[PDB]
Symmetry: none
Subunit: 23 residues, 4 copies
Amino acid sequence: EPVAEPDIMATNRVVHVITNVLQ
Amino acid sequence: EPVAEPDIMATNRVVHVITNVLQ
Amino acid sequence: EPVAEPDIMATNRVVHVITNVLQ
Amino acid sequence: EPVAEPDIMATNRVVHVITNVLQ
């Protein structure tokens, strides 16, 4: 993982896609 | 339901069920 | 059948809600 | 370094009612 001076960090995964309700 | 020998079956309407979209 | 089939229900449109997305 | 983990799985709930096969 990246190394640097201490700071605020929080790993997160975001996934989105355009879609419509099936019914 | 009626019981008899196999033969042509009249088409019956089908109603969908509301459910969360997979996408 | 022992239980009557569900009555026909018309699909209802759903309006999307605007939200902040990082991506 | 360790291999990056894949995208986090998004659990979903599916509800359906058994009915006559369309085919």
